[PDB]
From a paper:
Indeed, 2D class averages generated from initial cryo-EM images revealed particles resembling the canonical three-fold symmetry HNV F protein structure. Concurrently, we applied the same methodology to MojV F, where ectodomain residues 1–482 were used to express the prefusion conformation. Next, we determined the structure of MojV F to 2.66 Å. Here, a total of ~260,000 particles were extracted and 2D classified from ~9000 curated movies. Structural comparisons of LayV and MojV F ectodomains revealed several surface exposed, conserved (L23I, I33V, R64K, F71Y, K79R, L89I, K197R, L206I, E267D, V298I, V328I, E330D, Y345H, R370K, K411R, I420V, E430D, V444I) and non-conserved (G62S, N80K, V81A, L87M, N90D, A91T, D94N, N144S, R232G, G255E, T402A, L413S, S434N, N468E) substitutions in DI, DII and DIII. These are differences that should be noted, however we anticipate that cross-reactive responses between the two would be possible, given the high sequence similarity in the F glycoproteins (~90%). Despite an overall high structural resemblance between NiV prefusion F and the divergent LayV (RMSD = 1.8 Å) and MojV F (RMSD = 2.6 Å) structures, there are some notable differences. Conversely, the F1/F2 cleavage site of LayV more closely resembles the NiV and HeV site, despite high sequence homology between LayV and MojV in this region.
The HNV F protein is a trimeric type I fusion protein that is initially expressed as an F precursor (F0), consisting of three domains (DI, DII and DIII), a C-terminal stem, a transmembrane domain and a cytoplasmic tail. We found that LayV F and MojV F both adopt a “tree-like” prefusion F structure similar to that of NiV, despite only sharing ~40% sequence conservation at the amino acid level.
Author numbering:
A (entry chain B), B (entry chain C), C (entry chain A): 26 to 445
The structure:
């Protein structure tokens, strides 16, 4: 319970209401990002710059493969000793880890049969001559292959190649290769250092492809308009499963999760306004959002979640405990609520809820428009309630509002309430 | 009062001084952003990809117009019942809202006559064939029309169109349309969801126009060098007033505010240094900036404001209350000031103010350069003052400084001050 | 000491270990950024737009040179009066400053002989016709000169110049100049306002050169693969030393620092898990990282540092003091540790350290796989220890793990420990 009838007399008013959703089971797709382009159409003019680029790429990829091969051996070393049907992590060889790292280490082994199927297509992956392409694995699964720089050459150099000289072509292509290297290090740098525990969103991945994430979703067989709820929440993420150093490519597995609606769970918003005490202006201190689950009250940090037109969407169940004074305050003992003095006009003075208006008519102008007379609260009353029994249209500050009727047994009274 | 003479003996020294400015009355201009380009120069080669693009745009715009039409009906439903000269909000139909939402809902109705004037120019808006254009409304007001992709076709495809094949042109244009769609969703996505309460800065708006905000200000009749104080503060912002689904465009109103100088208001900076107590090194805890208005002291969170060479500029009056211990400390009762022990050399040891130097000569080397002898403070004194009565140039740490004269009645004394 | 044997019984477990590194002595290089391009190849077609651009650039540069000339006079006014071999700051003319500002003001004078050598090359700097170039000063030092827009004209306009008309060329170049002006104001705007105290990273500087920082490091004679540890930490930074208003260029000095390994300093990570008290689930509150230097314990805010595979790298020594209750807790008086109640399943239940597993087997399923039987802790015990004396493979939650042997004198006991 939140006992709104006692909260209103201390400036706390009932806002909007939402349901709670959290991430469900996954679905996955395969993508290959090529770092060495198929320059074969202009090959004779640019050989010197190309040979220099390949060595730098290979030096950059060599450390990553040893991190992957190391983690694969800790699981294989277990599976070969014991009869059990599941994968077994060798704890003595690993030595120190959180439960999350052990879980991601077993998932890396579980993904290895796709990586082996990709490795059988190496010569077909090398020979692509388009900016994006689709191929079929022996698993019957499809693979998407991305090749940005061959797109740049097809657009910018080939239509004018009769005007340019051989030295101009070589010098022109050389600067484009170093720009692409700078983009790769900016997008993938953190994942190349810690490949087992790091995930990247599809929006960030697309920065290597001019930011065109709409083409990426399209070639995987989706539509960006249908995926809106998980795309806008940034829940579509990928991770590295394998690296090929001699060919120069990265293989990624990309995940499209379901959403689960939590039963008996509600999120409630609270609106604060100022109020009058014996001639001074004060404000109450409370969190903006509160979570209720099967009568239990709790805090929730919505900065780690996305708010939509009707739902709050989180990656995990971010509920947090609540202190005894705040629980006492929200359950109707207003003497336990904390308060602060007002020194700026930026704090609001009125609000609308269920068609009724609550206002602090000692610090803002309130007038009745039908009879054209001012409205005054006593120096004993903290807040004033505006409904259609007195008159049908009110001026509040510099706005005109029409109001509904009060669902109660008599006149609203706010004289001399308990507070602390 | 801040009683700097007592604060100096506890390491708190007087810094720079600024005046306070807050946002004033507005001025506005009109802009139209087109989502469906005028492809008419290459039309025969790209019809298949164009027809697919238009349906996706229309599906994306259909939800936004219903949010706008819904809010317009809540005001019209009031205006038709009553004689009053101002606009009236229907509170029963709206049900729940903050004062800010009611205010933005009335402003949306007030802007509707410009939207109707724009809607009379629809055929002239469709026929533009340039990246940016100016038109005249029947209000005598001007309108700026933006068309990015027709600029791309004029630059990249038309000069080489004799070299490319029909299939190459179609495939080439198709990827540019999906890239533009990805850019729109990234820039406008939050505003398309909540069009009544959301505002966008001109810098962010320009990301749909290659980031060239200088052209946008130029066609509206301004110069980016004159607008520096409001542009650098990020106070130039726009909001959506209407949407046309069949033609595929968004109409925006853009605001250029005035700045108001608050009378009798001053912002004062404070500089902390370490100090000596009985052989140990300590530091005092105080906020960096303090606000004084007509003798009243208050806190101010300058992270929400911009600091210039002479003024602090804020969007609203962000003043906040101050606790009784901090007020006691700043008004000269140093026994109420809070302190901390020092465990790193990154904390500073000296500072310059009004041509005089204050230093902790037990934790840094202080020497007189004229006589070439060291300077020592007793174990009873917290801080030392360096002025030109003793000698004219000092070495402090690894820097040489020349100093002024002390405006006082005698020798400065820092023995055994009151502290807690 | 951290007395891990008492901490384990309250859910705090030993994580990874790192060494501490801080920034050392500098090394520097010279760079010139040109704001007025060498349009001389298309000059006849674009004169009107070019003359308009130059006046706006000069108006933008005029305020910056007076800030530089003002600070240079405060040092020169000292050096001319006194015999001392070092530079002398005039404190009366400066009036108010922090020790950091005095230090940067003397450094600006120390850099002035390079600025004079650059100023002798003005006609050679103006005549460059390439996107990037190298020149030699009379100091025998090299200078790197950047010219982005001449690169754009060499790539985009000259190969098609027989197809375009004179008016098309002029209009086309004019929009590229205003886009470049918008990019300059976005990258350098804060430094142009406060040129003495502001530094910019090489990644941010490169945004004026299509983001290609790899070319910048290459022409300065480095390789981005060797500089990884300081580049990834973002310690490579530059600052403005001079401005030329009539020619329209900015001169920068760029710094490549060394790293110093602090002796006898270690950073230790801590892993928290939940635990059982009399039937309820609880958690302990402690910082993630702790710093030890020659037996002294301290806090460290690693959000201002970079964490690698083995080292923590900071710009300055960010150590901070620690409270008496936390020191008491970590030195084995667990009655002083603070705790919280658990209301979400997102909190972890087990962890691996030194080949042994610690788990809360009342809130997760624990079973022995060799004998296929469940494991249970009493209602008196907070935590359970899993080692190879009982059986060699365990199921914990939904994962299978193989474990090592306990280095102790007998059975581990967690009954009825002291807590508060």
């Amino acid at each position: 319970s939140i006992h709104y009838d006692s909260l209103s007399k201390v400036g706390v008013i009932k806002g909007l209401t939402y349901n709670y959703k959290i991430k469900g089971s996954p679905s996955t797709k395969l993508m290959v990002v090529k770092l060495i382009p198929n320059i074969d159409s202009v090959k004779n003019c640019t050989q010197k710059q190309y040979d220099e680029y390949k060595n730098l790429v290979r030096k950059a990829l060599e450390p990553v493969k040893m991190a992957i091969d190391t983690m694969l051996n800790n699981v294989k070393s277990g599976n070969n000793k014991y009869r059990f049907a599941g994968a077994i992590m060798a704890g003595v060889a690993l030595g120190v880890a959180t439960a999350a790292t052990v879980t991601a280490g077993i998932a890396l082994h579980r993904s290895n049969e796709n990586a082996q199927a990709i490795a059988n297509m190496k010569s077909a992956i090398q020979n692509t001559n388009e900016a994006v392409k689709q191929l079929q694995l022996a698993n019957k699964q499809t693979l998407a292959v991305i090749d940005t720089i061959r797109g740049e050459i097809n657009n910018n150099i080939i239509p004018v190649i009769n005007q340019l000289s051989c030295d101009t072509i070589g010098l022109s292509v050389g600067i484009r290769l170093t720009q692409y290297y700078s983009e790769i290090i900016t997008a993938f740098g953190p994942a190349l250092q810690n490949p087992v525990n790091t995930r990247i969103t599809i929006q960030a991945i697309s920065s290597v492809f001019n930011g065109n994430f709409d083409e990426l979703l399209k070639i995987m067989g989706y539509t960006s308009g249908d995926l809106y709820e998980i795309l806008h929440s940034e829940l579509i993420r990928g991770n590295i499963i394998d690296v090929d150093v001699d060919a120069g490519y990265i293989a990624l597995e990309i995940e499209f999760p379901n959403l689960t609606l939590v039963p008996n769970a509600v999120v409630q918003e609270l609106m604060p306004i100022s109020y009058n005490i014996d001639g001074d202006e004060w404000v109450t201190l409370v969190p903006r959002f509160v979570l209720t689950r099967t009568t239990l009250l709790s805090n929730i940090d919505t900065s780690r979640c996305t708010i939509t037109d009707s739902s709050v969407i989180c990656d995990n169940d971010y509920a947090l405990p609540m202190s005894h004074e705040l629980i006492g305050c929200l359950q109707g003992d207003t003497s336990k609520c904390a308060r602060e003095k007002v020194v700026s006009s930026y704090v609001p003075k009125f609000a609308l809820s269920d068609g009724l208006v609550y206002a602090n008519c000692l610090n803002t102008i309130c007038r009745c428009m039908d009879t054209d007379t001012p409205i005054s609260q006593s120096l004993g009353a903290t807040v004033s309630l505006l409904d259609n029994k007195r008159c049908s249209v009110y001026q509040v500050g510099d706005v005109l509002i029409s109001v509904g009727s009060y669902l109660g047994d008599g006149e609203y009274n706010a004289d001399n309430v308990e507070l602390g």
